[PDB]
Write a sequence for this structure.
């Protein structure tokens, strides 16, 4: 059914548009696969964060219907406050009535103020929706709005423009080779299982690794213990607390590969290293969210810029294809 170009802030933040209300008030929301709620700065908020963002005004939408239910949604710190309501929400073109939205009441963290989006549109499963909010996608779903019950993401590199969110279709001009499928191991986050880690075609840490596939994370994150041997591998050393390493040593650095469903997919240094001039930082960090099984990897933006990503809700599976 359609796609749209969305924006890239320094390869950290991938955010784009949506419209809410009759007549429509337009907002920049982070497209987040690692969360399921929908919320927007609202005129019920007066924190400082809320002051510099685009606020949603319920009185100026002739389609709004309020619900007094409040939400307390700490997002794995984000940790705001909200009130539930209902209005028509449009994403990528002309679609969703009686869509349950969170209007913020108090929004702090030494990121809501300077974050570049006015709210968050969660794309994970209903299970992780704080306070039972119906995720957007689940509704397009139920209301049989899309051709196919898929969405996919292309992310650009070096902050170029060209990132895309495709809903109900895949964009064929964005990947090369074959789509590599793996099923969702848990219908929480978009979780998948990893059969093995390899560094230069050789083993190194997994037989039970799970990986959340998150657009909300700017990094690739590894299990707390194993972070270290990987560090020891490329030669990274603590610097403002970044793990940096000499540029000059970079074309000869290891290839990391994950065995997911029998296929071992590579991740070159070119991809996990950000060379932001004369300085090479290691974009890899320690896994922060708690495993409700056994330690987890988070495949944030560093994997997603290497792999075009397909999320499949009728068959519960995620697919990767090399990004073009």
């Amino acid at each position: 059914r359609v796609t749209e170009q969305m924006k890239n802030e320094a390869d950290t933040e991938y955010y784009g548009v949506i419209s809410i209300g009759t007549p429509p008030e337009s907002f920049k929301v982070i497209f987040d696969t690692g969360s399921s709620n929908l919320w927007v700065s609202s005129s019920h908020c007066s924190a400082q964060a809320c002051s510099n963002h685009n606020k949603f005004k319920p009185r100026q939408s002739s389609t709004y219907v309020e619900t007094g239910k409040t939400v307390d949604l700490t997002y794995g710190t984000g940790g705001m406050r909200g009130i539930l309501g209902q209005d028509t929400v449009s994403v990528g073109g002309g679609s969703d009535p009686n869509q349950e939205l969170g209007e913020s009441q108090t929004e702090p963290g030494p990121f809501q103020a300077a974050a570049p989006f006015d709210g968050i549109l969660g794309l994970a499963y209903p299970s992780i929706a704080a306070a039972g909010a119906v995720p957007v996608f689940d509704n397009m779903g139920s209301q049989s709005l899309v051709e196919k019950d898929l969405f996919s993401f292309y992310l650009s590199g070096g902050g170029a423009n060209g990132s895309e969110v495709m809903l109900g279709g895949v964009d064929n001009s964005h990947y090369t080779g074959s789509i590599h499928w793996i099923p969702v191991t848990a219908e929480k986050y978009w979780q998948v299982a990893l059969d093995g880690i390899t560094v230069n075609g050789q083993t190194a840490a997994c037989e039970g690794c799970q990986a959340i596939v998150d657009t909300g994370t700017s990094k690739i994150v590894a299990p707390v213990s194993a972070l270290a041997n990987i560090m020891k591998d490329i030669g990274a050393s603590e610097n403002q607390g970044e793990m940096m390493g000499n540029c000059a040593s970079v074309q000869s650095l290891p290839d990391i590969t994950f065995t997911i469903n029998g296929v071992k997919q590579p991740l070159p240094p070119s991809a996990y290293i950000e060379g932001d001039q004369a300085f090479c930082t290691s974009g890899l960090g320690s896994s922060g969210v708690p495993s409700n099984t056994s330690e987890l990897w988070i495949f944030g933006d560093v994997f997603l810029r290497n792999y075009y990503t397909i999320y499949d809700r009728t068959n519960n599976k995620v697919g990767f294809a090399p990004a073009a």
Notes: The first helix runs from residue 48 to 51. The chain has five helices and 26 strands. Helices lie at 48-51, 136-142, 224-234, 269-272, 301-304. The CA atoms of residues 21 and 215 lie 26 Å apart.
